[PDB]
Amino acid sequence: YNYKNYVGRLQSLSKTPSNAAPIQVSLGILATQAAKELISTASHFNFRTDIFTLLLRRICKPRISTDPTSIQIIQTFETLLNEDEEGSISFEILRIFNKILKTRNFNIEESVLNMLLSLDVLHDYDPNTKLKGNVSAPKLKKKDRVHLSKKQRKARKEMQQIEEEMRNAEQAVSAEERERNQSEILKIVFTIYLNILKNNAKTLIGSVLEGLTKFGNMAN
């Protein structure tokens, strides 16, 4: 309840027509910074859609160069799209982005449109990529174990056998959902790019063609 009220207040304060007193503009800027900082970890929580909507509305303004936070919000959105592999948060952001663009007749800054270039869901890598060197003790040593009762050991076995099948099912569900999210995001991105091309905005052509070249081979 309190987080809902806080996010609603942040959204209300973010909307400032840049014509009121400078105190209100400062309030809106601080609210936008707070929302930008909050979404870095509260993305997997309730009412993330409101934060996404307010941040994208701030970004999708016709003039954002005077805004002292557009750089940071674009960086955060790019990081969110880059680190998201399953495609759930990416699709959630892209739906709102398309909804906002359709209202503005697809008129944004090339830089804004550049966030779609960082979509991890539309990227494919080597099946055997080398991750970072991560080292940990494989198993607790036998002579350094903690005593467990027979009932405790039986419960440990049961919960391990449950967890193994839960992990298998989780992997299967993630694999089957990534493909569908990828298809939906491809549809949305290609629709946005084609609408931009039909509008023929002289300041957005290069980014659009780069997006087509990057994501062209991921489609059907």
Partner RNA sequence: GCCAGCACCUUUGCUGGCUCCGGUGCGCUUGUGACGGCCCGUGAAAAUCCACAGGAAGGAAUAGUUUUCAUGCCAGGUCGUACUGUC
Residues that bind RNA (CB under 7 A): 138-143, 145-148, 153-154, 156-157, 160-161
The C-alpha R_g of the chain, in whole angstroms, comes to: 23
Smallest gap from Cβ 143 to RNA, in A, equals 5
Closer residue to RNA in complex, CB, 20/159: 159
Closer residue to RNA in complex, CB, 132/141: 141
Smallest gap from Cβ 147 to RNA, in A, equals 6
Closer residue to RNA in complex, CB, 123/157: 157
Closer residue to RNA in complex, CB, 156/180: 156
How far CA 108 is from CA of 65, 141, 160, in Å, comes to 12, 59, 51
CB neighbour list of residue 122: distance below 8 Å, 6 or more residues apart: 182, 185, 186, 189, 214, 215, 218
- Angle formed at CA 80 by CA 75 and CA 81, multiple of 5 degrees: 100
Smallest gap from Cβ 171 to RNA, in A, equals 17
Smallest gap from Cβ 160 to RNA, in A, equals 6
Closer residue to RNA in complex, CB, 83/170: 170
Q: What does the alpha-carbon distance between residue 67 and residue 93 come to, in Å, rounded to a whole number?
A: 21
Smallest gap from Cβ 110 to RNA, in A, equals 51
Element (H, E) at 150: helix 150-199
* Angle, in degrees to the nearest 10, between helices 48-59 and 22-38: 130
Closer residue to RNA in complex, CB, 143/198: 143
How far CA 72 is from CA of 39, 51, 93, 179, in Å, comes to 12, 15, 17, 30
Q: What does the alpha-carbon distance between residue 84 and residue 108 come to, in Å, rounded to a whole number?
A: 24
Smallest gap from Cβ 142 to RNA, in A, equals 4
